Amino acid sequence: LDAVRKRPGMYIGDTDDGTGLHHMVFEVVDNAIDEALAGHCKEIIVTIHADNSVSVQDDGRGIPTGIHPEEGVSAAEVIMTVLGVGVSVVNALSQKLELVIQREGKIHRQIYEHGVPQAPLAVTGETEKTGTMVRFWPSLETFTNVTEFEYEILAKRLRELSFLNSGVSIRLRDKRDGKEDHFHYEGG
Amino acid sequence: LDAVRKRPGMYIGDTDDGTGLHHMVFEVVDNAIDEALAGHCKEIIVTIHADNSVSVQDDGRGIPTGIHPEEGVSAAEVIMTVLGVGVSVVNALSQKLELVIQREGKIHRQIYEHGVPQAPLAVTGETEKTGTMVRFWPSLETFTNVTEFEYEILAKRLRELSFLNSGVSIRLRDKRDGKEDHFHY
Ligand SMILES: Nc1nc2ccccc2[nH]1
Ligand SMILES: O=[N+]([O-])c1ccc(O)cc1
Ligand SMILES: O=[N+]([O-])c1ccc(O)cc1
Numbered sequence A: 001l002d003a004v005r006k007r008p009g010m011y012i013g014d015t016d017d018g019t020g021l022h023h024m025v026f027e028v029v030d031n032a033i034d035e036a037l038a039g040h041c042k043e044i045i046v047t048i049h050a051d052n053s054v055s056v057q058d059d060g061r062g063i064p065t066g067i068h069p070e071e072g073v074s075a076a077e078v079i080m081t082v083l084g085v086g087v088s089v090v091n092a093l094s095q096k097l098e099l100v101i102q103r104e105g106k107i108h109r110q111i112y113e114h115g116v117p118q119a120p121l122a123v124t125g126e127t128e129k130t131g132t133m134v135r136f137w138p139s140l141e142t143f144t145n146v147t148e149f150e151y152e153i154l155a156k157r158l159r160e161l162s163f164l165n166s167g168v169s170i171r172l173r174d175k176r177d178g179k180e181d182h183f184h185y186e187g188g
Numbered sequence B: 001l002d003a004v005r006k007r008p009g010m011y012i013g014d015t016d017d018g019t020g021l022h023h024m025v026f027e028v029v030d031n032a033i034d035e036a037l038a039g040h041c042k043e044i045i046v047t048i049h050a051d052n053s054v055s056v057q058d059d060g061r062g063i064p065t066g067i068h069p070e071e072g073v074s075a076a077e078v079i080m081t082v083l084g085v086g087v088s089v090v091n092a093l094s095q096k097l098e099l100v101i102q103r104e105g106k107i108h109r110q111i112y113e114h115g116v117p118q119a120p121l122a123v124t125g126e127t128e129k130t131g132t133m134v135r136f137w138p139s140l141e142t143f144t145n146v147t148e149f150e151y152e153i154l155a156k157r158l159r160e161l162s163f164l165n166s167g168v169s170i171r172l173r174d175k176r177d178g179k180e181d182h183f184h185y
Helices: A002-006 A019-037 A075-081 A087-092 A151-164 B002-006 B008-012 B019-037 B075-081 B087-092 B151-164
Strands: A043-048 A054-058 A094-103 A106-113 A122-126 A131-138 A169-174 A180-183 B043-048 B054-058 B094-103 B106-113 B122-126 B131-138 B169-174 B180-183
Touching: A002 A087, A019 A043, A019 A054, A019 A087, A019 A131, A019 A151, A043 A151, A075 A087, A075 A094, A075 A106, A087 A094, A087 A131, A151 A169, A151 A180, B002 B008, B002 B087, B008 B019, B008 B087, B019 B043, B019 B054, B019 B087, B019 B131, B019 B151, B043 B151, B075 B087, B075 B094, B075 B106, B087 B094, B087 B131, B151 B169, B151 B180
Parallel strands: A043 A169, B043 B169
Antiparallel strands: A043 A054, A054 A131, A094 A106, A094 A131, A106 A122, A169 A180, B043 B054, B054 B131, B094 B106, B094 B131, B106 B122, B169 B180
């Protein structure tokens, strides 16, 4: 991850005019869509929290959690820490990132700070559901000037995405003011 | 450096009881002593600053500054960012690290934050002096409980080092209270 830290702009885009900031969300959303597409119900929920973090969750199969035989850490951690640009860039540029994966009857949790895992991926409970949830707090050390998410920028993009990804239900919720939207297109 | 950030204790020592914290200084001092041995005057100065950062400097030749053929960045940056454990570990666990090198008639400076260079090593002026200086501010995200340097812990180890590195002069200064020592065997 140090290459990204060294020159963030080369990976996420402009870190001062808000474009890179929102790009962080879109990158996570792209992964979420992929996940949602591989399951039956296909629902993604994007939430703008009051503390200016954003969470993206999908009800897919859950990203893999088993230990990578070469890397020596869980697959999820490899996905988050190795290398659209990929969620690892997002992790790298986030002051905090919370990862929750529901898969095989188990809830797995992990926390990262500036892309550094605070502990290995851990099974903390049981669950009847499946899916992946990522919540991130953009690093204020990286993102300057524009540091708060604009609902409209997210809504417009999610709306466009919904038509391209038929069958995928996409919900947008803004806990700062209670605004909500639901983009769902059939087509196929 | 992510391996280091992930398990700091395994590289620098216990991050809660002061062990690791003081080890940071010792790692830098090892490099400094090596530089001093290679120079003419042979003196190093270790300063505990008021803000609980520590600087270590030598009057040696100055660490290499040219671009590393394989890494593509200055040799100094390679030293600070590529894996005693080495000063890259110290860099990794420091919220800030300032590097200054006086070599071949030029002054070179670079700043790091959590092991990340803020810019490439750069020539900032001319000088007749030679040597290297590194000042680091231990990350308080990593070091807990014991977060302030203890003069006696540093002094004890520096005294041991003075005997072992006989020709080298070692000064310890504490700016928090004016305390100082001079170890020279
Ligand atoms: N605050 C802060 N910024 C960081 C950048 C890289 C690794 C750890 C870090 N902690
Ligand atoms: O891979 N990822 O980073 C993801 C995948 C799915 C999701 O809902 C959020 C993030
Ligand atoms: O290589 N280093 O990190 C050094 C070298 C010399 C010095 O005085 C301080 C630090």
